[PDB]
From Swiss-Prot:
It comes from Foot-and-mouth disease virus (isolate Bovine/United Kingdom/A12Valle119/1932 serotype A) (FMDV). A motif (Cell attachment site) lies at residues 5-7. The lineage of its organism: Viruses, Riboviria, Orthornavirae, Pisuviricota, Pisoniviricetes. It is found in: Virion; Host cytoplasm. This is Capsid protein VP1. Forms an icosahedral capsid of pseudo T=3 symmetry with capsid proteins VP2 and VP3. The capsid is composed of 60 copies of each capsid protein organized in the form of twelve pentamers and encloses the viral positive strand RNA genome. Mediates cell entry by attachment to an integrin receptor, usually host ITGAV/ITGB6. In addition, targets host MAVS to suppress type I IFN pathway. Upon acidifcation in the endosome, dissociates into pentamers.
Amino acid sequence: GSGVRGDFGSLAPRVARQL
């Protein structure tokens, strides 16, 4: 229920103006 959809592979975000 409280999982998280996505495909194998971990990664982070990629901002420029944000922290």
